[PDB]
Amino acid sequence: MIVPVRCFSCGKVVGDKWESYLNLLQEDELDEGTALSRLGLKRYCCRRMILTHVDLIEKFLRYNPLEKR
């Protein structure tokens, strides 16, 4: 739903790389191979988190019960 802290297979902290990854794809126009490599994701167990994370919490957060719309 939101970015997983501490990837599943080895245990490297991964959860802080998500918003830097969207920076390294949008502002600095890099492909997904370089942008995972610059974030220190060398093992492919780490590399399949940030590559394939859906980040579906942004679709959840548009249903706010505590504000008029």
Binding site: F8, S9, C10, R43, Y44, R47, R48, L51
Partner: protein, 57 residues
């Protein structure tokens, strides 16, 4: 399950220091038996394993 009809219950949440590990440093997080393949002939799961790992690299 996989996406190729390879269903099966979990059997023991096997501890990390008792799992196989690579020269890369990783350890898998699902072990599957190879004997579930030849009677079932789900080679689309074998070629997904190449296509998955070549994709994440």
């Amino acid at each position: 399950s996989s996406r190729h009809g390879q269903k099966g219950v979990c059997s023991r949440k096997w501890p990390t220091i008792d799992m196989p590990f690579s020269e890369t440093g990783i350890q898998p997080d699902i072990i599957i038996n190879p004997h579930a393949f030849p009677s079932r002939m789900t080679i689309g799961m074998f070629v997904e394993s190449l296509a998955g790992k070549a994709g994440a690299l």
